Amino acid sequence: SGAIYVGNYRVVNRHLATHNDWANLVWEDSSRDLLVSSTTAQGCDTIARCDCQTGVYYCSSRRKHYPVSFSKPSLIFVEASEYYPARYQSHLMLAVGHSEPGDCGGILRCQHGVVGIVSTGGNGLVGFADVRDLLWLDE
Numbered sequence: 001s002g003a004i005y006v007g008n009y010r011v012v013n014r015h016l017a018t019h020n021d022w023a024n025l026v027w028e029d030s031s032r033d034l035l036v037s038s039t040t041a042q043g044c045d046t047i048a049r050c051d052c053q054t055g056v057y058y059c060s061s062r063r064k065h066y067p068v069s070f071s072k073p074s075l076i077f078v079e080a081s082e083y084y085p086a087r088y089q090s091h092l093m094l095a096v097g098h099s100e101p102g103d104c105g106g107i108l109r110c111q112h113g114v115v116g117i118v119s120t121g122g123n124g125l126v127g128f129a130d131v132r133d134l135l136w137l138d139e
């Protein structure tokens with residue numbers, strides 16, 4: 001679990017969105033596993049606007065932050081699950097590191113701010129849904 005709060009927006013994994021998230025829906029994309037809902041309170045997270053390939057992510061299954069090198073956002077095949085059939089997920093970045101299903105929502109950050117959130121994992125690889133291209137989050 002975990003979300004990004006920027007201005008009047010809440011960014012979450014689409015497979016983990018709540019009834020409230022869907023009732024205050026701004027945008028959602030199944031191919032990216034992302035959903036954005038509106039909020040009454042103001043958010044203070046800073047989104048990075050960069051092409052960084054190094055950062056730090058929070059891993060709840062270990063109660064620890066880990067430094068990682070990660071790939072540029074791309075279409076990567078993701079094995080079937082209870083939330084989606086087998087498909088290519090777009091805007092996905094991979095790193096060598098630990099992750100478990102409950103780790104989704106953990107933030108990945110570089111020196112410029114929030115890069116993305118944990119979205120996939122397995123075989124000693126963790127996947128992050130990139131958010132740096134969503135320029136509208138800041139307006």
Ligand SMILES: NC(=O)[C@H]1CCCN(C(=O)Cc2ccncc2Cl)C1
Binds near residue numbers: 121
């Ligand atoms: N983005 C998706 O389609 C995910 C939906 C939930 C299931 N997905 C996983 O990868 C779950 C997983 C398994 C083992 N270790 C880490 C993780 Cl995050 C895929």
Ligand SMILES: [Zn+2]
Binds near residue numbers: 048050052111112113
């Ligand atoms: Zn950066």
